[PDB]
Swiss-Prot record, chain A:
The modification Phosphothreonine is found at T87. The modification N6-acetyllysine is found at K6. The lineage of its organism: Eukaryota, Metazoa, Chordata, Craniata, Vertebrata. Phosphorylation affects the GDP/GTP exchange rate. Residues 1-83 form the GST C-terminal domain. EF-1 is composed of 4 subunits: alpha, beta (alpha subunit of the eEF1B subcomplex), delta (beta subunit of the eEF1B subcomplex), and gamma (gamma subunit of the eEF1B subcomplex). Interacts with elongation factor EEF1A1. It comes from Homo sapiens (Human). This is Elongation factor 1-beta. Disulfide bonds: none annotated. Belongs to the EF-1-beta/EF-1-delta family. The modification Phosphoserine is found at S7, S41.
Swiss-Prot record, chain B:
It comes from Homo sapiens. This is Elongation factor 1-gamma. It comes from the Eukaryota. GO terms for cellular component: cytoplasm; cytosol; extracellular exosome; membrane; nucleus. GO terms for molecular function: cadherin binding; translation elongation factor activity.
Length: 87, 210
């Protein structure tokens, strides 16, 4: 997980995670993108370049969100592995 | 609707790749004839394509077009071409940038590793700096963008990727490309799109400079 996606430090983890990525999972948009997106809720600060870039990209997909492949997971399952993880 | 015809080229031509990747997006049914060779000099070929260049395209309706960017445009769709005049101007921008700014110094640097050229340690090193400048420009542009035009792949990304293909494969070793993380993220994303992948195959970034 990224932690609290409505806090700065969480957005910093989301940003660092997106430095070498265009999507949350893989190389095409998925439901993984939609869930983190809805959790961020509002455009990250521009200084979090990779986070904001990814935000504007997924936002361009909002009109067709449910059509995106994959299935929603718990926010903790996205991004960096949590060392202490259930399941 | 979508174009249908024959694409004459030599095998694994990065210039033909532009039109083959675009066709994957559009649904254009493009046949490749490669195994040919010096057939570009046959009289018939010359009529159809006086330039004698490849790649060259002959539609099933007799329509012929003989330059790489033009074949890719033709077998593309509105989305790749640019749906608005702004988007379409931006496509032309990156295509022309690829042709004028990337192709020559990439040629000067790469051909020697390939042996196609003659190595002039000054020219080759200046070409390096040129490429570095290009990578840098792409990197700063892509800091806020996933793709070059709009929020979808266009002829811009397709053209630039194929143009940078040989650099990334043979010469842009990790130590060299680390100064441009956004261009590399963009490059990896692009070549991993299903459409790119069906043409390029798995693309291995240069581990060690050639």
């Amino acid at each position: 997980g990224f932690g609290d996606l409505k806090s700065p430090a969480g957005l910093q983890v989301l940003n660092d995670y997106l430095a070498d990525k265009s999507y949350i999972e893989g190389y095409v948009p998925s439901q993984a993108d939609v869930a983190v997106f809805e959790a961020v809720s509002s455009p990250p600060p521009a200084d979090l370049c990779h986070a904001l870039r990814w935000y504007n990209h997924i936002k361009s997909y909002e009109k067709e969100k449910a059509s995106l492949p994959g299935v929603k997971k718990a926010l903790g399952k996205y991004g960096p592995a949590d060392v202490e993880d259930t399941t | 609707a979508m174009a249908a015809g024959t694409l004459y080229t030599y095998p694994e031509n990065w210039r033909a790749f532009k039109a083959l990747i675009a066709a994957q997006y559009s649904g254009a049914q493009v046949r490749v004839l490669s195994a040919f060779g010096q057939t570009n000099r046959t009289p018939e070929f010359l009529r159809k394509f006086p330039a004698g260049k490849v790649p060259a395209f002959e539609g099933d309706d007799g329509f012929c077009v003989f330059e790489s960017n033009a074949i890719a445009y033709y077998v593309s769709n509105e989305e790749l071409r640019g749906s608005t005049p702004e988007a379409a101007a931006q496509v032309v921008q990156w295509v022309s940038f690829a042709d004028s700014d990337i192709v020559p110094p990439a040629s000067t640097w790469v051909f020697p590793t390939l042996g196609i050229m003659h190595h002039n340690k000054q020219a080759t090193e200046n070409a390096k700096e040129e490429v570095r400048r290009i990578l840098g420009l792409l990197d700063a542009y892509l800091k806020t963008r996933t793709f070059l035009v709009g929020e979808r792949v266009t002829l811009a990304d397709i053209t630039v990727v194929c143009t940078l293909l040989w650099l990334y494969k043979q010469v842009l070793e990790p130590s060299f490309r680390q100064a441009f993380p956004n261009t590399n993220r963009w490059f990896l994303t692009c070549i991993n799109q299903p459409q790119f992948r069906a043409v390029l195959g798995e693309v291995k970034l240069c581990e060690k400079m050639a």
